[PDB]
């Protein structure tokens, strides 16, 4: 069988943006197998070895003025540049969520009704899902499966709510998302 | 912060695997096909708003290999430790009978970036309409990957995402069936 040892090498250039393009940080990092060995942090201004394995590179790369100069200006020429280029179809990409409410197929403890608020197919991932019982927000009993990233520029999540249903009550699921000017609501009539 | 754009690349010996991609908040923007020497946009429309010179990935990858060689020798040929994947199977949306959907096999937290994934419909291999992504980066430097299978729900069909990785002593099968 194939049992040869593997040897990996990753290179990553991370551009972190705060308040749009107001503050930008470039983080160039090298990883041997699962160990980051050396990096260039625009906040630091030069390469810094992360482990002994990277010491030679930090020293050698810092001795190259042209390289350091390029790395030092990349926050503008690289980060802010590519942000301007991709802004229209990434930062501004918006797809409204599909929202539906139905009871869980579970329903363990008898005289109780576990509600499921399904929110899917949306983008970006930033979203707020809240439950309300007759106009007032519910704090306890609420449970989420968390935000699921589908890998296709789409997200989904389920937010359950344990209840003691009483004829006449109106349990509302509220969803606030960048794709809509006003919150989306789906009611469950108990 | 609010946004992160990552240019991630890698080279793996002795498989000779090379990859070059761009990531936006965890979602791939595009990667470069090293054989056809062209840019492959994650979503078709992206390619109409921007462009990327694929030859640039090929120049970088050559430097990345040379560096891998140097580092391999510098660590006294310390090989990578296999870290097995966490596998989860889910539908991209709530499932309803005879209602088109897509099975998603999420392979996460693993390294090195090499895996064999196959779908099984009632114990048999499925090839129709399946697609997959390239290895995506993680802050811990391990990888993520998605495999998809478009299908039509029914109480008769049962599926399995079969994953093989050097970190797994045996192939891992994640079962899925209509239980809603």
């Amino acid at each position: 069988g194939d049992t040869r040892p593997r040897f990996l090498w990753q290179l990553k250039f991370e551009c972190h943006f705060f308040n749009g393009t107001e503050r930008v940080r470039l983080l160039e990092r090298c990883i041997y197998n699962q160990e980051e060995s050396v990096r260039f942090d625009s906040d630091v201004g030069e390469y810094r070895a992360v482990t002994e394995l990277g010491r030679p590179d930090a020293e050698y790369w810092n001795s190259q003025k042209d390289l350091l100069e390029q790395r030092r200006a990349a926050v503008d020429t690289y980060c802010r540049h590519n942000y301007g280029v991709g802004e229209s179809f990434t930062v501004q990409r918006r797809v409204e969520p599909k929202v539906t409410v139905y009871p869980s197929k579970t329903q363990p403890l008898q005289h109780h009704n576990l509600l499921v608020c399904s929110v899917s197919g949306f983008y970006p991932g930033s979203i707020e899902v809240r439950w309300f019982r007759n106009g007032q927000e519910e704090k306890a009993g609420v449970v989420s499966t968390g935000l699921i990233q589908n890998g296709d520029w789409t997200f989904q999540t389920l937010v359950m709510l344990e209840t003691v249903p009483r004829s006449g009550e109106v349990y509302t699921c509220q969803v606030e998302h960048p794709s809509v000017t006003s919150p989306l609501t789906v009611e469950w009539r108990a | 912060e609010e946004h992160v754009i990552i240019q991630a690349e890698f080279y793996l010996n002795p498989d000779q695997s090379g990859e070059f991609m761009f990531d936006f908040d965890g979602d791939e923007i595009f990667h470069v096909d090293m054989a056809k020497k062209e840019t492959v946009w994650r979503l078709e429309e992206f390619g109409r708003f921007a462009s990327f010179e694929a030859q640039g990935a090929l120049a970088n990858i050559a430097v990345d290999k040379a560096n891998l060689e140097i580092m391999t020798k510098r660590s006294n040929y310390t090989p990578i430790t296999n870290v097995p994947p966490e596998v989860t199977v889910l539908t991209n949306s709530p499932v309803e009978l005879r209602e088109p959907n897509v099975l998603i096999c999420f392979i996460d937290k693993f390294t090195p970036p090499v895996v064999n994934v196959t779908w099984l419909r009632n114990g048999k291999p499925v090839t129709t309409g399946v697609s997959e992504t390239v290895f995506l980066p993680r802050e811990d430097h391990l990888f993520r990957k998605f495999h998809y299978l478009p299908f039509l729900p029914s109480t008769e069909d049962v599926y399995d995402c079969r994953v093989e990785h050097w970190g797994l002593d045996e192939p891992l099968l994640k079962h899925w069936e209509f239980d809603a």
Binding site: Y60, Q64 | G56, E69
Partner: peptide, 15 residues
């Protein structure tokens, strides 16, 4: 609009 890449730096010895 073109997305611009950062270019890899060679380690010493690899040069």
């Amino acid at each position: 609009p073109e997305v611009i890449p950062m270019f890899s730096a060679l380690s010493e010895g690899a040069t």
